[PDB]
């Protein structure tokens, strides 16, 4: 979806490279230069200001605009803007690793707290693997706390050789809320760890040191854990549910970005102006807050920044969050088209795999059958028959990515067809469907059935496939899905068939016996006592479809 041709060569994704956004990679992705916390209104004139949402990125309203690309909404993805912070500030969920990295390196000088001049260390250096290498190194040198200049070489403990200069003691580090703290060692000396500082420190660490310490020269270098500018999320990331006109409807997310921007301007206009220097920092701890809040707002540091009404605001981590969240709910299954739920009842007469489907649905649901010699007659027939005669159709689709409302268009009872077109038609009898009854506990709750189109408003099925899905008749509701690709109905009809799962590879046995009425009487009848007579017997014989035709 996102129609109309594309000169673009199609491919598929083989690898996903997870790296970290460098301030310049952003400061280059970026079209627009976000400076204004006002969405739009050109001093109140409905539109947008060259500041936030579409200074030159995605667009609201059904109007083509968007830096040249036009195209318009459905088709357009976001185009990113950037936000230059005042002074560098911390990432939220990278802060644990920031601490655990500060603990392994000498600040002020920038290097490892251990070389190949120490076997317990050099032996962690053999540990090929980021996660446990970094781990062995952090466990290893979080104890060591002075910037050694000289170590006992692998000869003897007498002559210590020299490796790196400065020695300035390492302050043992503790975290507090959204700040870092050090204490250089009678009595310690507690000093706060300032961003810009820590930054510069990371930023003077050599490349090999990078590497061995779980960091990647091109896709993820330490500096980027401390943000300079900002990834400014294009419009439909944060979509405004406007109410016609003269209102708005913006997103909590957009309001948090306007909030951030605000805070940033506030700070900035103290570093140009008359700085109560140690009141400037009193506002930097706002930037540091919000930028951490728009990523995450459920930390340990209680303050769960609400937004004017009690609403906690939904930090981004909350959209990806488990169940219902993007992944456990949108990308691992979703709501979908060509589907149908209804009350199920049982009929003792349709072949195991048949499935009684009401008119209202053999009427509602479309199969897109293509336009081809063996069917033309049929297809046209339906078409003229129109979306109301039971065996009708609903849309014709032209080789020009163009639909036809088979209940609207003037040319209703007209249109000849076209070799290479598409009839979206009603649902015929013996058709492949993917019936199923959640909860999904095995193959046997999720099978394919041949359709039998019928009256009344109830799904109908075979008593003895009651145990596979496991549905009583106290009023159970069931799901139905419809094929779409020919080969879809293939996979369905050669794999998912209800008589394919008569023998279960779970207990190496049948999972679809006879039941209740049936069995109960199959016994009442089997008996020695049970002698039938001509009249009835005959009715019996005929009752059986294959009966060779012999008494």
């Amino acid at each position: 979806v996102g129609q109309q041709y594309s000169s673009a060569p199609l491919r598929t994704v083989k690898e996903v490279q997870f790296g970290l956004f460098s301030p310049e990679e952003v400061r280059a992705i970026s079209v627009a230069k976000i400076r204004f916390p006002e969405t739009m209104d050109e001093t109140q004139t409905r539109a947008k200001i060259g500041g936030l949402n579409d200074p030159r990125l995605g667009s609201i309203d059904r109007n083509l605009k968007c830096q040249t690309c036009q195209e318009g909404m459905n088709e357009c993805p976001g185009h990113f803007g950037h936000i230059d912070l005042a002074k560098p500030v911390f990432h939220v969920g990278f802060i644990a690793k920031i601490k655990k990295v500060c603990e392994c390196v000498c600040m002020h000088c920038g290097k490892l707290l251990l070389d190949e001049h120490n076997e317990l260390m050099r032996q962690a250096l053999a540990i090929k693997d980021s996660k446990k290498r970094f781990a062995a190194i952090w466990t290893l040198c979080k104890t060591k706390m002075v910037c050694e200049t000289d170590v006992p070489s692998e000869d003897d403990p007498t002559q210590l050789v020299s490796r790196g200069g400065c020695g300035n003691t390492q302050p043992t580090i503790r975290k507090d809320g959204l700040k870092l703290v050090g204490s250089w060692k009678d009595e310690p000396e507690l000093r706060v760890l300032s961003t810009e500082e820590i930054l510069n420190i990371f930023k003077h660490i050599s490349v090999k040191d990078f590497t061995s310490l779980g960091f990647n020269e091109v896709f993820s270098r330490p500096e980027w854990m401390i943000l300079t500018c900002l990834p400014v999320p294009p419009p439909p990331v944060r979509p405004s549910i406007s109410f016609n006109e003269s209102q708005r409807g913006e997103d909590d997310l957009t309001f948090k970005l306007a909030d951030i921007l605000k805070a940033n301007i506030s700070l900035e206009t103290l570093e140009h102006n008359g700085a109560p220097h140690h009141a400037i920092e009193e506002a930097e701890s706002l930037l540091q807050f919000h930028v951490a809040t728009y990523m995450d707002n459920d930390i340990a540091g209680q303050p769960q920044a609400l937004q004017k009404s009690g609403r906690p605001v939904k930090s981004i981590r909350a959209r990806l969050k488990g169940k219902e969240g993007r992944i456990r709910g949108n990308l691992m299954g979703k709501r979908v088209d060509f589907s149908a739920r209804t009350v199920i009842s049982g009929d003792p007469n349709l072949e195991l795999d048949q499935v009684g489907v009401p008119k209202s649905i053999a009427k509602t649901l479309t199969y897109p059958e293509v336009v081809t010699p063996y069917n033309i007659d049929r297809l046209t027939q339906l078409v003229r028959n129109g979306p109301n005669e039971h065996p009708g159709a609903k849309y014709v689709i032209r080789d020009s990515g163009d639909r036809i409302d088979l209940r609207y268009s003037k040319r209703a009872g007209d249109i000849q067809l076209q070799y290479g077109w598409k009839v979206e038609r009603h649902i015929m009898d013996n058709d492949p469907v993917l019936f199923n009854r959640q909860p999904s506990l095995h193959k046997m709750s999720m099978m394919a059935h041949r359709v039998k189109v019928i009256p009344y408003s109830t799904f109908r099925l075979n008593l003895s496939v009651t145990s596979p899905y496991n549905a009583d008749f106290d009023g159970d509701e069931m799901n139905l899905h419809v094929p779409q690709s020919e080969e879809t109905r293939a996979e369905l009809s050669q794999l998912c068939a209800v008589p394919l799962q008569i023998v279960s590879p779970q207990s190496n046995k049948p999972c679809m016996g006879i039941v209740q009425d049936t069995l109960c009487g199959i016994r009442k009848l089997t008996l020695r006592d049970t002698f039938i007579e001509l009249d009835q017997v005959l009715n019996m014989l005929y009752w059986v479809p294959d009966w060779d035709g012999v008494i």
């Binding site: 000169s7 060569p9 091109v218 896709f219």
Partner: protein
């Protein structure tokens, strides 16, 4: 729908670097001597001088006017219009480029015999210069190196004044008349 070639290096993200070109022989990373063949076998550079080209096109377009009928089953001046005919059937009808170049070549070639041509080739491919240097030398005329290596900068120190001198002397001999 794009078109591919035989040597993709890693998308190291590091976009920058790839230099510009000159008669320091410096070509794109698509035209240096060592380039891998189609069956995977390393192979030198295929830089063909004028004429050598016209012959290539004529021929491979004759095997084309041949194959284009094997399934049908079920002199300067003159070459001009003869080939303005060959193309007239073999192309698709849009190669303004390809026809143009046919004229250019057919008029500016120095040789027109699969014989004299070869001759030249086995003459030049003796001083193992860049298959380019070769080519240029094999489609542009001269008298002294003073012109030669001036118009073909890539030489200069590579092949001596008097030996490139001989090679010129020989080339104005093998110069197929018109």
């Amino acid at each position: 729908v794009s078109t591919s070639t035989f040597q993709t290096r890693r998308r190291r993200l590091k976009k920058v670097e790839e230099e510009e070109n000159a008669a320091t022989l410096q070509l794109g990373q698509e035209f240096q001597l060592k380039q891998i063949n189609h069956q995977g076998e390393e192979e030198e550079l295929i830089a063909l001088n004028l004429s050598e080209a016209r012959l290539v096109i004529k021929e491979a377009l004759v095997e084309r006017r041949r194959a284009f009928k094997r399934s049908q089953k079920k002199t300067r001046e003159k070459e001009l219009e003869s080939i303005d005919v060959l193309l007239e059937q073999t192309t698709g009808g849009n190669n303004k480029d390809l026809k143009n170049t046919m004229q250019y070549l057919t008029n500016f070639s120095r040789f027109r015999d699969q014989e004299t041509v070869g001759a030249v080739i086995q003459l030049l491919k003796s001083t193992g210069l860049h298959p380019f240097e070769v080519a240029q030398l094999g489609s542009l005329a001269c008298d002294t190196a003073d012109e030669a290596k001036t118009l073909i900068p890539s030489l200069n120190n590579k092949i001596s004044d008097d030996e490139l001198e001989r090679i010129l002397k020989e080339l104005s001999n093998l110069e197929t008349l018109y």
